[PDB]
From TrEMBL, chain A:
<dbReference type="GO" id="GO:0006412">
    <property type="term" value="P:translation"/>
</dbReference>
<protein>
    <recommendedName>
        <fullName>Small ribosomal subunit protein mS23</fullName>
    </recommendedName>
</protein>
<keyword id="KW-0687">Ribonucleoprotein</keyword>
<comment type="similarity">
    <text>Belongs to the mitochondrion-specific ribosomal protein mS23 family.</text>
</comment>
<dbReference type="GO" id="GO:0031965">
    <property type="term" value="C:nuclear membrane"/>
</dbReference>
From TrEMBL, chain B:
<protein>
    <submittedName>
        <fullName>Coiled-coil-helix-coiled-coil-helix domain containing 1</fullName>
    </submittedName>
</protein>
<dbReference type="InterPro" id="IPR010625">
    <property type="entry name" value="CHCH"/>
</dbReference>
<keyword id="KW-0479">Metal-binding</keyword>
<keyword id="KW-1015">Disulfide bond</keyword>
<feature type="modified residue" description="N-acetylalanine">
    <location>
        <position position="1"/>
    </location>
</feature>
TrEMBL record, chain C:
<keyword id="KW-0687">Ribonucleoprotein</keyword>
<dbReference type="GO" id="GO:0032543">
    <property type="term" value="P:mitochondrial translation"/>
</dbReference>
<protein>
    <submittedName>
        <fullName>28S ribosomal protein S28, mitochondrial</fullName>
    </submittedName>
</protein>
<dbReference type="GO" id="GO:0005763">
    <property type="term" value="C:mitochondrial small ribosomal subunit"/>
</dbReference>
<keyword id="KW-0689">Ribosomal protein</keyword>
TrEMBL record, chain D:
<feature type="binding site">
    <location>
        <position position="20"/>
    </location>
    <ligand>
        <name>Zn(2+)</name>
    </ligand>
</feature>
<keyword id="KW-0411">Iron-sulfur</keyword>
<keyword id="KW-0687">Ribonucleoprotein</keyword>
<dbReference type="GO" id="GO:0005763">
    <property type="term" value="C:mitochondrial small ribosomal subunit"/>
</dbReference>
<dbReference type="GO" id="GO:0005743">
    <property type="term" value="C:mitochondrial inner membrane"/>
</dbReference>
Length: 135, 116, 99, 97
RNA sequence: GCGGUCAUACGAUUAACCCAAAUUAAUAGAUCCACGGCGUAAAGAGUGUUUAAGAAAAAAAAUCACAAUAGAGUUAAAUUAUAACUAAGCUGUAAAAAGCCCUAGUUAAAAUAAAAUAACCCACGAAAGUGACUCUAAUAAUCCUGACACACGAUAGCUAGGACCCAAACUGGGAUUAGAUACCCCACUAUGCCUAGCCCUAAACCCAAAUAGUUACAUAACAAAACUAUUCGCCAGAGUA
RNA sequence: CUGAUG
């Protein structure tokens, strides 16, 4: 018939050995496909033990240097007037234009944080965006 | 807010004396307790007081004062109508409170996961 | 070829940062008798209530404005190895594509 | 070789921590007007954390100052001084519904 | 464990099985307990320090609000000894009875005992233990484990002196029961209170030993998930105990 | 309120 065992291993590891033993005298059609293109991980059963102690997950947080600049704009003026449009792939927000102006002014050899921060807000008035400083 | 729970129970990692001694394991069940015969209060008490005031003043006769007899019947009819209509309106809607018969089905949709 | 690392940095979700009080635009995709499932576009769809002003102007496919509060309501309780996800989002109605 | 990889940095959007009403303040045992804003006007029970909302430091010092002022003769125990009844309500408890 | 008219288990017969000039029965023997455990089955000893003794196998540190403890001073609520007005009732249980009518309420009131809310706080101390206020002294180790030695060790018990509002072992009454030397009600004592000196016991339980760590293999059951390296003290069926 | 045993 077959092997209804789960914790021993994978379906391939349970069918190939059975066919080698000679009980299953008919080869499944998917076995040739599995031998031709095996997956990256063998589907072995693994029990999700809970993580105790000082151990922590191996995932690393996502943070960029642009976030350190966006924090300044979000603490100074808050949310921009032009609402975000999550459907447009190339949508550029007010804070995105601000951090672009910031990183552009950084190349001019400006090391003062105030010089890099207020000049971008003053230059955005040339493009003509409206800023609402939260006080 | 919710009281603190760190350093309360008796565990191997807790170095001090356990503070809380739970009778049963502090696991949030997937069904709430059924309300013990939720009751209600009477009605038209103020309308009955001013009605019996006529009886006590005019020596128990209805031909003397009449509006205190008609408003009492109107309050009784309105209470009788609200006892029947709201008994279905509040069970169809969920703006305010709700019986546990729906809280249980709401919790079973998103139950707690003790294992895994 | 543009890999994933470059296309993720230029995502509007990355530019938005935290989801606390952000003005976004969402297109309604389903209509109930009184509730509105508005998909702001990030992960989930927020459920809002139909206001009394221009409540008839809200139809299937209309774009509206929202102030995003939370992206996905998840929290932990007693004896829960994982969180209890609401499979929704938190947002309020301000306008309907003021333009 | 990619330059758009996330960098292991701190959280820039980390909001400041919530402060208690007396955070970075100087509590005393003689300001009866200050200590009365945390006791019940009808009985004199000292309100707890769930009603006041004070962080771990000032909560105990307020209680110590109240207990000192109730024995030294600064503030009555069985009730609240009615002269300090017109003080602004700081607690989060509502009696008259 | 089998023996109440169906005994393959008793006594006899037949038959069969296993040894064999040996077969059974009894007693001695060899071997067999733990390089395994100590939360619920026997087991982490009530706590700390220290001698002897043992590994210091790679690097790090010592100490902060809050009720440790020991002395001295103090009292906010209630209660009471005591006086004054009022009433014949007060306390008492599911219902009563007994007891007190030098009783009961209000206004004042020392001495003693204890220390509402804060406390949904979790700190201090080695443990027991500690949270009404203030003052003085002070809470070891440039920090491993380690006794039968040393020093502590809640309530309860003893001795001497003092205190006694209140609660109460015991005792005397009143209920209920067939009986109640008990649960229910009243009165009262030792005692609980302070100093000095003993006694050194607990479900002294967090039933989980200390020192530095891990989330690797891995659910007897339940319970607080499974474990490492050095140790200390215990565990050989149960009752007898 | 109370109600013992097989
Ligand atoms: Mg239990
Ligand atoms: Mg239960
Ligand atoms: Mg026979
Ligand atoms: Mg025989
Ligand atoms: Mg053994
Ligand atoms: Mg045992
Ligand atoms: Mg022990
Ligand atoms: Mg012992
Ligand atoms: Mg003393
Ligand atoms: Mg007094
Ligand atoms: Mg009598
Ligand atoms: Mg006296
Ligand atoms: Mg006290
Ligand atoms: Mg300690
Ligand atoms: Mg020390
Ligand atoms: Mg030592
Ligand atoms: Mg006495
Ligand atoms: Mg007495
Ligand atoms: Mg007696
Ligand atoms: Mg004694
Ligand atoms: Mg003792
Ligand atoms: Mg104890
Ligand atoms: Mg033991
Ligand atoms: Mg099972
Ligand atoms: Mg030891
Ligand atoms: Mg024995
Ligand atoms: Zn504070």
């Amino acid at each position: 018939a077959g092997s209804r065992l789960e914790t021993v291993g994978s379906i391939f590891s349970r069918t190939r050995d059975l066919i080698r033993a000679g009980v299953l005298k008919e080869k499944p059609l998917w076995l040739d496909i599995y031998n031709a293109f095996p997956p990256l991980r063998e589907p072995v059963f693994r029990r999700p033990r809970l993580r105790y102690g000082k151990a922590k997950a191996a995932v690393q947080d996502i943070f960029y240097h642009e976030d350190r600049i966006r924090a300044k704009f979000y603490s100074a003026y808050g949310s921009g007037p032009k609402a975000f449009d999550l459907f447009n792939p190339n949508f550029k927000s007010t804070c995105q234009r601000f951090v672009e102006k910031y990183i552009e002014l950084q190349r001019l050899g400006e090391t003062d944080e105030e010089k890099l921060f207020v000049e971008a807000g003053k230059a955005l008035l040339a493009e003509g965006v409206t800023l609402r400083r939260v006080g | 807010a919710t009281p603190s729970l760190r350093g309360r129970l008796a565990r191997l990692g807790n170095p001090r004396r356990p503070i809380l001694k739970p009778n049963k394991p502090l696991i949030l069940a997937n069904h709430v307790g059924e309300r013990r015969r939720e009751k209600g209060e009477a009605t038209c008490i103020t309308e009955m007081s001013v009605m019996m005031a006529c009886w006590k003043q005019n020596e128990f006769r209805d031909e003397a004062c009449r509006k205190e007899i008609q408003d009492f019947f109107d309050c009784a009819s309105r209470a009788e109508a609200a006892r029947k209509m709201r008994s279905i309106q509040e069970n169809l809607g969920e703006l305010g409170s709700l019986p546990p018969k729906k809280l249980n089905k709401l919790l079973h949709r998103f139950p707690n996961k003790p294992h895994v | 070829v543009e890999s994933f690392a470059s296309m993720l940095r230029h995502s509007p979700l990355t530019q938005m940062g935290p989801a606390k009080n952000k003005l976004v635009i969402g297109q309604i995709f389903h209509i109930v008798e009184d509730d509105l499932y508005i998909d702001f576009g990030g992960k989930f769809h927020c459920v809002c209530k139909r206001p009394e002003v221009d409540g008839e102007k809200y139809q299937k496919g209309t774009r509206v404005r929202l102030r995003l509060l939370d992206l996905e309501l998840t929290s932990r309780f007693l004896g829960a190895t994982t969180d209890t996800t609401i499979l929704e989002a938190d947002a309020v109605l301000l306008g309907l594509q003021e333009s | 070789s990619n330059e758009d990889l996330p960098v292991p940095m701190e959280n820039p959007y980390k909001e400041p921590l919530k402060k208690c009403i007396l955070c970075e303040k100087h509590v005393d045992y003689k300001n009866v007007q200050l200590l009365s804003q945390f006791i019940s006007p009808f009985t004199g029970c000292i309100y707890g954390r769930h009603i006041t909302g004070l962080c771990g430091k000032k909560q105990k010092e307020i209680t110590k100052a109240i207990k000192r002022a109730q024995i030294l003769g600064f503030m009555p125990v069985t009730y609240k001084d009615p002269a300090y009844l017109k003080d602004p309500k700081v607690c989060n408890i509502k009696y008259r519904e």
